[PDB]
Amino acid sequence: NGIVPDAGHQGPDVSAVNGGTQVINIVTPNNEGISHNQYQDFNVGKPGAVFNNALEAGQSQLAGHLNANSNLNGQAASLILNEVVSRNPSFLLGQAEVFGIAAEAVLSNPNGITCDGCGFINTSRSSLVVGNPLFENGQLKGYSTLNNTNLLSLGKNGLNTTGLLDLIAPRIDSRGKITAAEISAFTGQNTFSQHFDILSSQKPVSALDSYFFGSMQSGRIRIINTAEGSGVKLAGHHHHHH
Amino acid sequence: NGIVPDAGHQGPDVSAVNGGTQVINIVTPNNEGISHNQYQDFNVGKPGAVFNNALEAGQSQLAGHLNANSNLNGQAASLILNEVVSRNPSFLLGQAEVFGIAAEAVLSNPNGITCDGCGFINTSRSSLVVGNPLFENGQLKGYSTLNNTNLLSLGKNGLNTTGLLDLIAPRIDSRGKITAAEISAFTGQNTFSQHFDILSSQKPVSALDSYFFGSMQSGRIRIINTAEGSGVKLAGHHHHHH
């Protein structure tokens, strides 16, 4: 019951295997190739969650045998955008798998995202955005972390993916092992393009320091904190107030 | 007496103000704009060191009034390459200033480099290379950290520069605040171009993990560890053996 779709036209169908692994029959992709899914709640438990991007029945890693997603009509999604539209933060405590055609995946939740033993399967690029998507004339234009001080937290059990990983938030607090083909961590109050080019940056009211403890196992690591007055702190397992 | 030039044709003239701040009259730049200085020892103490890249007398920050460097004939260096050719590691315990025309600066020492409260003044780009420069037909071709397991250590008093910073070594162990316009840390056993493009990478005999504790205050941070079996560990103030 961790994932609760919005009642409107962008809410996908969600069902759970024996109360466990959640399967999301994502909405039909639009002309941009984006399946834009909106949620009142988005949380993944230990048993994980599957985005059904399959045109034929088959074998998912987390859920076993699944039928095709009948919301797709001949064309799978290129980008699976999951947007939390409520005030509820997200907790990711297990794996998220794209079943079927490999895609990019984005979770946006301006209220905060916590990962702890989460990961992304069959994703070419996975992005966790503590912010909102920006739409203009019905097209995705990018993302915004403006006027937001909430946290992308990564816990001691870490985050694993074979694909590219973007960590996009006002601030990050990571305490575990991050594994990805490449890690990009862009922090501060910013607007971004769809590709996470930084388009603009605000000066925050107070410091937005990010903290990293643990390890990073990746081909490339890039970190950019655009907040004035702020930095990137390489922490031990606690950061006590001074 | 921390800096001891080689006796040959690339050894600069070195003198100390009252036994304190060391002033290096760097050798004449070659047709590539490189002043290629070779040393039996290169160490900077608390009072700092000055590379004299000045065509006229003037005011250095660390040493006060200095005469022009008569080794330059009308043309200042573009790149000040400082190569330790002995087995002695380098310790940088104070600031290093380019007096006169802003230049790029490189210290190469395959035996190890330790920074602790060091920094770089009036440098557009400063590179610390635990490795050797590569020359072919008399021209600088790049740098090599191949077949080397030594350490670029950065201590609790940190490293500060207004320019770009490259940290190039088999492994890095940093325990302080690193301040730079941009930080690039490329670790593992590699060959590099003159611009620190990674041209090739070796598989080391044993793990080459790098460790970072402290903080990074920069516009851009990039870290690449090319060593198989190895990672980037975000440490607390100790990393005890497990």
Swiss-Prot record, chains A, B:
It comes from the Bacteria. It is found in: Cell outer membrane. The conserved amphipathic domains in ShlA and HpmA may be responsible for pore formation. Bacterial hemolysins are exotoxins that attack blood cell membranes and cause cell rupture by mechanisms not clearly defined. Cell-bound hemolysin, which releases heme-iron from erythrocytes by interaction with the erythrocyte membrane. HpmA requires HpmB function. This is Hemolysin. It comes from Proteus mirabilis. The lineage of its organism: Bacteria, Pseudomonadati, Pseudomonadota, Gammaproteobacteria, Enterobacterales. The gene is hpmA. The chain holds residues 30 to 265 of 1577 of the full protein.
